[PDB]
Write a structure and sequence with these properties.
Two copies of one chain form a homodimer.
Chain A (H helix, E strand, L loop, with lengths): L6 E10 L7 E4 L3 H10 L9 E5 L4 E5 L8 E13 L67 E3 L7 E3 L9
Antiparallel strand pairs in A: 1-5, 2-4, 3-4, 3-5, 6-7
Chain lengths: 173, 173
Amino acid sequence: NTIHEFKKSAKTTLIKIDPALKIKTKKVNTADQCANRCTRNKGLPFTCKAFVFDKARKQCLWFPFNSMSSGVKKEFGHEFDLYENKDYIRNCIIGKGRSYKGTVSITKSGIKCQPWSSMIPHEHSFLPSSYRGKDLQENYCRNPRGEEGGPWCFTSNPEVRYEVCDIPQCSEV
Amino acid sequence: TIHEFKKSAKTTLIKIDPALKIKTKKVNTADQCANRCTRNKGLPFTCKAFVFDKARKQCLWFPFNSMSSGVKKEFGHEFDLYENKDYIRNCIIGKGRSYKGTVSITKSGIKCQPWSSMIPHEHSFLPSSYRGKDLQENYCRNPRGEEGGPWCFTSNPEVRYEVCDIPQCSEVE
Ligand SMILES: O=S(=O)(O)CCN1CCN(CCS(=O)(=O)O)CC1
Protein backbone atom coordinates (compact mmCIF):
# COMPACT_ATOMS: atom_id res chain seq x y z
CA ASN A 1 0.00 0.00 0.00
CA THR A 2 2.02 2.89 -1.42
CA ILE A 3 -0.70 5.57 -1.68
CA HIS A 4 0.61 7.57 1.30
CA GLU A 5 3.88 7.99 -0.66
CA PHE A 6 2.28 10.27 -3.31
CA LYS A 7 1.56 14.01 -3.15
CA LYS A 8 -2.24 14.32 -3.11
CA SER A 9 -4.29 17.15 -4.63
CA ALA A 10 -8.04 16.89 -3.93
CA LYS A 11 -10.78 17.63 -6.50
CA THR A 12 -8.28 17.60 -9.35
CA THR A 13 -7.61 15.68 -12.53
CA LEU A 14 -5.28 16.48 -15.45
CA ILE A 15 -6.11 17.00 -19.12
CA LYS A 16 -3.59 16.88 -21.97
CA ILE A 17 -3.81 19.77 -24.44
CA ASP A 18 -1.19 17.99 -26.55
CA PRO A 19 -3.08 15.05 -28.11
CA ALA A 20 0.25 13.23 -28.59
CA LEU A 21 0.64 12.51 -24.85
CA LYS A 22 -0.43 9.04 -23.71
CA ILE A 23 -2.78 7.88 -20.94
CA LYS A 24 -3.91 4.50 -19.60
CA THR A 25 -7.15 3.88 -17.68
CA LYS A 26 -8.83 1.02 -15.83
CA LYS A 27 -11.96 0.35 -13.78
CA VAL A 28 -10.94 -0.50 -10.23
CA ASN A 29 -12.30 -0.76 -6.67
CA THR A 30 -10.09 1.63 -4.68
CA ALA A 31 -7.43 4.36 -5.07
CA ASP A 32 -4.70 2.17 -3.43
CA GLN A 33 -5.02 -0.13 -6.43
CA CYS A 34 -4.04 2.74 -8.73
CA ALA A 35 -1.14 3.61 -6.41
CA ASN A 36 0.20 0.07 -6.40
CA ARG A 37 0.23 -0.17 -10.20
CA CYS A 38 1.90 3.25 -10.53
CA THR A 39 4.63 2.49 -7.97
CA ARG A 40 5.35 -0.89 -9.57
CA ASN A 41 4.86 0.52 -13.11
CA LYS A 42 3.40 -2.82 -14.13
CA GLY A 43 1.62 -3.12 -17.49
CA LEU A 44 2.09 0.55 -18.41
CA PRO A 45 3.82 1.42 -21.73
CA PHE A 46 5.46 4.51 -20.16
CA THR A 47 6.90 5.87 -16.91
CA CYS A 48 4.08 6.56 -14.44
CA LYS A 49 4.58 10.02 -12.91
CA ALA A 50 1.06 10.53 -11.60
CA PHE A 51 -2.39 9.02 -11.38
CA VAL A 52 -5.95 10.13 -10.73
CA PHE A 53 -8.63 8.15 -8.96
CA ASP A 54 -12.19 8.91 -10.16
CA LYS A 55 -14.36 8.08 -7.14
CA ALA A 56 -17.65 8.31 -9.12
CA ARG A 57 -16.61 6.11 -12.08
CA LYS A 58 -14.21 3.93 -10.06
CA GLN A 59 -11.38 4.42 -12.49
CA CYS A 60 -7.63 4.81 -12.41
CA LEU A 61 -6.01 7.14 -14.92
CA TRP A 62 -2.22 6.67 -15.11
CA PHE A 63 -0.06 9.42 -16.67
CA PRO A 64 3.48 9.78 -18.04
CA PHE A 65 3.30 13.36 -16.78
CA ASN A 66 2.28 15.47 -13.77
CA SER A 67 0.57 18.83 -13.10
CA MET A 68 3.81 20.69 -13.95
CA SER A 69 4.47 19.01 -17.33
CA SER A 70 4.31 20.93 -20.60
CA GLY A 71 1.08 20.39 -22.52
CA VAL A 72 -1.12 19.48 -19.54
CA LYS A 73 -3.50 21.50 -17.36
CA LYS A 74 -5.49 20.90 -14.19
CA GLU A 75 -9.24 20.39 -14.31
CA PHE A 76 -11.61 20.72 -11.36
CA GLY A 77 -13.92 17.89 -10.39
CA HIS A 78 -15.43 16.76 -7.10
CA GLU A 79 -15.01 13.12 -8.13
CA PHE A 80 -11.23 13.31 -8.77
CA ASP A 81 -8.16 13.08 -6.56
CA LEU A 82 -4.70 13.58 -8.10
CA TYR A 83 -1.68 11.68 -6.82
CA GLU A 84 1.74 12.71 -8.06
CA ASN A 85 4.78 10.44 -7.85
CA LYS A 86 7.36 12.22 -5.68
CA ASP A 87 10.20 10.88 -7.86
CA TYR A 88 9.06 13.34 -10.53
CA ILE A 89 8.55 16.39 -8.29
CA ARG A 90 11.89 18.22 -8.08
CA ASN A 91 13.12 17.78 -4.51
CA CYS A 92 15.89 20.38 -4.58
CA ILE A 93 15.69 24.18 -4.76
CA ILE A 94 16.45 26.46 -7.69
CA GLY A 95 17.47 30.00 -6.63
CA LYS A 96 15.47 30.95 -3.54
CA GLY A 97 12.95 28.16 -4.20
CA ARG A 98 10.07 30.34 -5.36
CA SER A 99 9.08 27.40 -7.56
CA TYR A 100 9.61 24.63 -4.96
CA LYS A 101 6.66 22.17 -5.00
CA GLY A 102 8.20 19.32 -2.99
CA THR A 103 6.70 17.89 0.18
CA VAL A 104 9.31 18.63 2.90
CA SER A 105 7.28 19.82 5.92
CA ILE A 106 9.80 20.09 8.78
CA THR A 107 11.99 23.07 9.64
CA LYS A 108 15.78 23.24 9.94
CA SER A 109 15.58 22.55 13.70
CA GLY A 110 13.19 19.63 13.28
CA ILE A 111 9.86 21.36 13.99
CA LYS A 112 6.74 20.13 12.17
CA CYS A 113 5.33 22.89 9.97
CA GLN A 114 1.96 24.43 10.72
CA PRO A 115 -0.63 24.10 7.92
CA TRP A 116 -0.95 27.22 5.72
CA SER A 117 -4.76 27.00 6.11
CA SER A 118 -4.48 27.06 9.91
CA MET A 119 -4.20 30.10 12.20
CA ILE A 120 -2.94 27.84 15.02
CA PRO A 121 -0.51 28.29 16.70
CA HIS A 122 0.33 31.26 14.47
CA GLU A 123 -2.18 33.69 13.03
CA HIS A 124 -1.01 34.85 9.61
CA SER A 125 -2.10 36.19 6.23
CA PHE A 126 -0.35 33.63 3.96
CA LEU A 127 -3.67 32.10 2.96
CA PRO A 128 -3.55 29.82 -0.12
CA SER A 129 -6.19 32.02 -1.82
CA SER A 130 -3.85 35.05 -1.55
CA TYR A 131 -1.03 33.06 -3.15
CA ARG A 132 -2.35 31.18 -6.16
CA GLY A 133 0.48 29.49 -8.04
CA LYS A 134 2.59 29.21 -4.87
CA ASP A 135 1.09 25.87 -3.74
CA LEU A 136 0.50 26.81 -0.07
CA GLN A 137 -0.96 23.36 0.56
CA GLU A 138 -0.93 21.11 3.64
CA ASN A 139 2.08 22.19 5.77
CA TYR A 140 4.76 22.20 3.06
CA CYS A 141 7.86 24.41 3.21
CA ARG A 142 7.33 27.23 0.69
CA ASN A 143 8.78 30.62 -0.26
CA PRO A 144 5.68 32.38 -1.67
CA ARG A 145 7.30 35.85 -1.64
CA GLY A 146 10.72 34.80 -3.04
CA GLU A 147 12.67 35.86 0.03
CA GLU A 148 16.41 35.33 0.45
CA GLY A 149 16.10 32.72 3.22
CA GLY A 150 14.55 30.07 0.96
CA PRO A 151 11.46 27.94 1.72
CA TRP A 152 10.11 28.24 5.23
CA CYS A 153 6.93 27.64 7.19
CA PHE A 154 5.00 28.71 10.23
CA THR A 155 5.93 26.31 12.97
CA SER A 156 3.80 23.96 15.16
CA ASN A 157 5.81 25.17 18.19
CA PRO A 158 3.91 28.17 19.66
CA GLU A 159 7.28 29.63 20.73
CA VAL A 160 8.70 29.73 17.19
CA ARG A 161 6.48 31.67 14.78
CA TYR A 162 8.37 30.67 11.61
CA GLU A 163 11.62 29.00 10.57
CA VAL A 164 13.42 28.16 7.32
CA CYS A 165 13.53 24.57 6.13
CA ASP A 166 16.75 22.79 5.18
CA ILE A 167 16.21 21.93 1.49
CA PRO A 168 19.34 21.52 -0.66
CA GLN A 169 20.15 23.57 -3.73
CA CYS A 170 19.95 21.52 -6.94
CA SER A 171 23.35 22.88 -8.05
CA GLU A 172 25.81 25.13 -6.24
CA VAL A 173 29.53 24.43 -6.71
CA THR B 1 8.33 3.04 6.26
CA ILE B 2 11.84 1.69 5.54
CA HIS B 3 11.00 1.65 1.79
CA GLU B 4 11.03 5.47 1.58
CA PHE B 5 14.82 5.09 1.90
CA LYS B 6 17.64 4.08 -0.41
CA LYS B 7 19.64 1.33 1.29
CA SER B 8 23.43 1.01 1.03
CA ALA B 9 24.57 -2.29 2.58
CA LYS B 10 27.67 -2.54 4.77
CA THR B 11 28.07 1.26 4.86
CA THR B 12 28.12 4.08 7.42
CA LEU B 13 28.84 7.86 7.41
CA ILE B 14 31.28 10.04 9.46
CA LYS B 15 31.15 13.85 9.95
CA ILE B 16 34.16 16.13 9.27
CA ASP B 17 32.41 19.24 10.62
CA PRO B 18 31.89 18.57 14.37
CA ALA B 19 29.04 21.13 14.44
CA LEU B 20 26.81 18.70 12.52
CA LYS B 21 24.11 17.32 14.82
CA ILE B 22 23.65 13.58 15.47
CA LYS B 23 21.30 11.53 17.65
CA THR B 24 21.72 7.89 18.59
CA LYS B 25 19.60 5.29 20.39
CA LYS B 26 19.69 1.59 21.20
CA VAL B 27 16.75 0.05 19.36
CA ASN B 28 15.66 -3.43 18.18
CA THR B 29 15.38 -3.26 14.36
CA ALA B 30 16.24 -0.95 11.43
CA ASP B 31 12.50 -0.53 10.79
CA GLN B 32 12.28 1.34 14.14
CA CYS B 33 14.98 3.82 13.03
CA ALA B 34 13.09 4.43 9.77
CA ASN B 35 9.88 5.17 11.67
CA ARG B 36 11.55 7.70 13.97
CA CYS B 37 13.32 9.33 10.99
CA THR B 38 10.05 9.49 8.96
CA ARG B 39 8.04 10.87 11.93
CA ASN B 40 11.08 13.10 12.71
CA LYS B 41 10.01 12.76 16.33
CA GLY B 42 12.31 14.07 19.07
CA LEU B 43 15.13 14.92 16.65
CA PRO B 44 16.43 18.52 16.83
CA PHE B 45 17.07 18.62 13.05
CA THR B 46 15.66 17.43 9.75
CA CYS B 47 16.43 13.71 9.49
CA LYS B 48 17.89 12.98 6.04
CA ALA B 49 19.46 9.57 6.66
CA PHE B 50 20.18 7.06 9.36
CA VAL B 51 22.51 4.14 9.95
CA PHE B 52 21.50 0.93 11.75
CA ASP B 53 24.30 -0.81 13.63
CA LYS B 54 23.22 -4.46 13.47
CA ALA B 55 25.81 -5.58 16.09
CA ARG B 56 24.84 -2.94 18.67
CA LYS B 57 21.20 -2.57 17.51
CA GLN B 58 21.77 1.20 17.55
CA CYS B 59 20.18 3.85 15.29
CA LEU B 60 22.28 6.82 14.23
CA TRP B 61 20.09 9.62 12.81
CA PHE B 62 21.68 12.36 10.69
CA PRO B 63 20.72 15.74 9.20
CA PHE B 64 23.00 14.81 6.27
CA ASN B 65 23.47 12.04 3.71
CA SER B 66 26.37 10.70 1.57
CA MET B 67 26.16 13.63 -0.90
CA SER B 68 26.51 16.24 1.85
CA SER B 69 29.81 18.15 1.82
CA GLY B 70 32.15 16.86 4.52
CA VAL B 71 30.87 13.40 5.42
CA LYS B 72 32.72 10.16 4.73
CA LYS B 73 31.08 7.07 3.30
CA GLU B 74 32.87 4.12 5.01
CA PHE B 75 32.69 0.31 4.80
CA GLY B 76 31.65 -1.56 7.96
CA HIS B 77 30.10 -5.04 7.90
CA GLU B 78 27.70 -4.36 10.82
CA PHE B 79 26.26 -1.12 9.35
CA ASP B 80 23.50 -0.46 6.83
CA LEU B 81 22.97 3.10 5.58
CA TYR B 82 19.46 4.35 4.74
CA GLU B 83 19.05 7.64 2.91
CA ASN B 84 15.77 9.59 2.79
CA LYS B 85 14.69 9.84 -0.87
CA ASP B 86 13.45 13.43 -0.38
CA TYR B 87 17.14 14.42 -0.05
CA ILE B 88 18.67 12.53 -2.96
CA ARG B 89 18.46 14.81 -6.01
CA ASN B 90 15.70 13.44 -8.30
CA CYS B 91 16.58 15.47 -11.38
CA ILE B 92 19.58 15.42 -13.64
CA ILE B 93 22.41 17.88 -14.14
CA GLY B 94 24.16 17.82 -17.53
CA LYS B 95 23.93 14.23 -18.82
CA GLY B 96 23.31 12.84 -15.35
CA ARG B 97 26.71 11.30 -14.61
CA SER B 98 26.00 12.10 -10.97
CA TYR B 99 22.47 10.66 -10.76
CA LYS B 100 22.08 8.51 -7.61
CA GLY B 101 18.29 8.31 -7.22
CA THR B 102 16.26 5.10 -7.11
CA VAL B 103 14.29 5.25 -10.36
CA SER B 104 14.40 1.77 -11.97
CA ILE B 105 11.96 1.96 -14.91
CA THR B 106 12.81 2.86 -18.54
CA LYS B 107 11.11 5.57 -20.61
CA SER B 108 8.76 2.98 -22.21
CA GLY B 109 7.80 1.53 -18.80
CA ILE B 110 10.10 -1.51 -18.65
CA LYS B 111 11.55 -2.62 -15.28
CA CYS B 112 15.37 -2.39 -15.33
CA GLN B 113 17.61 -5.43 -15.09
CA PRO B 114 19.97 -5.53 -12.06
CA TRP B 115 23.51 -4.40 -12.94
CA SER B 116 24.71 -7.62 -11.24
CA SER B 117 22.48 -9.89 -13.37
CA MET B 118 23.50 -11.25 -16.77
CA ILE B 119 19.91 -12.34 -17.48
CA PRO B 120 18.33 -11.57 -19.88
CA HIS B 121 21.27 -9.43 -21.04
CA GLU B 122 24.99 -10.14 -20.67
CA HIS B 123 27.21 -7.09 -20.07
CA SER B 124 30.42 -5.66 -18.59
CA PHE B 125 28.86 -2.84 -16.50
CA LEU B 126 29.79 -4.40 -13.14
CA PRO B 127 29.98 -2.48 -9.82
CA SER B 128 33.63 -3.59 -9.37
CA SER B 129 34.50 -2.22 -12.82
CA TYR B 130 32.77 1.09 -12.01
CA ARG B 131 33.61 2.00 -8.39
CA GLY B 132 31.79 5.17 -7.25
CA LYS B 133 29.14 5.02 -10.01
CA ASP B 134 26.60 3.29 -7.71
CA LEU B 135 25.71 0.53 -10.18
CA GLN B 136 23.68 -1.15 -7.43
CA GLU B 137 20.27 -2.85 -7.65
CA ASN B 138 18.52 -2.05 -10.98
CA TYR B 139 18.79 1.76 -10.74
CA CYS B 140 18.91 3.97 -13.81
CA ARG B 141 22.50 5.15 -14.16
CA ASN B 142 24.82 7.04 -16.53
CA PRO B 143 28.33 5.73 -15.64
CA ARG B 144 29.99 7.09 -18.83
CA GLY B 145 27.97 10.29 -19.21
CA GLU B 146 26.17 9.28 -22.39
CA GLU B 147 23.69 11.33 -24.39
CA GLY B 148 20.18 10.28 -23.28
CA GLY B 149 20.90 10.46 -19.53
CA PRO B 150 20.59 7.58 -17.03
CA TRP B 151 19.63 4.26 -18.58
CA CYS B 152 19.59 0.57 -17.80
CA PHE B 153 19.67 -2.92 -19.15
CA THR B 154 16.07 -3.88 -19.56
CA SER B 155 14.20 -6.88 -18.09
CA ASN B 156 12.53 -7.36 -21.51
CA PRO B 157 14.75 -9.75 -23.55
CA GLU B 158 13.69 -7.89 -26.75
CA VAL B 159 15.19 -4.61 -25.51
CA ARG B 160 18.86 -4.79 -24.46
CA TYR B 161 19.01 -1.29 -22.99
CA GLU B 162 16.94 1.92 -22.92
CA VAL B 163 17.16 5.31 -21.24
CA CYS B 164 14.93 6.11 -18.31
CA ASP B 165 12.85 9.28 -18.07
CA ILE B 166 14.55 11.22 -15.27
CA PRO B 167 13.84 14.93 -15.75
CA GLN B 168 16.49 17.62 -16.19
CA CYS B 169 16.64 19.96 -13.19
CA SER B 170 15.99 22.74 -15.74
CA GLU B 171 12.82 21.12 -17.15
CA VAL B 172 10.49 23.00 -14.75
CA GLU B 173 10.58 26.67 -13.61
O1 LIG C 1 5.78 35.98 10.52
S1 LIG C 1 5.05 37.03 9.79
O2 LIG C 1 3.72 36.54 9.36
O3 LIG C 1 4.89 38.20 10.68
C1 LIG C 1 5.92 37.51 8.45
C2 LIG C 1 6.13 36.34 7.49
N1 LIG C 1 7.56 36.22 7.27
C3 LIG C 1 8.37 37.40 6.98
C4 LIG C 1 9.81 37.11 7.43
N2 LIG C 1 10.24 35.91 6.72
C5 LIG C 1 11.67 35.74 6.48
C6 LIG C 1 11.84 35.03 5.14
S2 LIG C 1 12.68 33.61 5.33
O4 LIG C 1 13.98 33.89 5.98
O5 LIG C 1 11.90 32.69 6.18
O6 LIG C 1 12.91 32.97 4.00
C7 LIG C 1 9.27 34.91 6.27
C8 LIG C 1 8.16 34.89 7.32
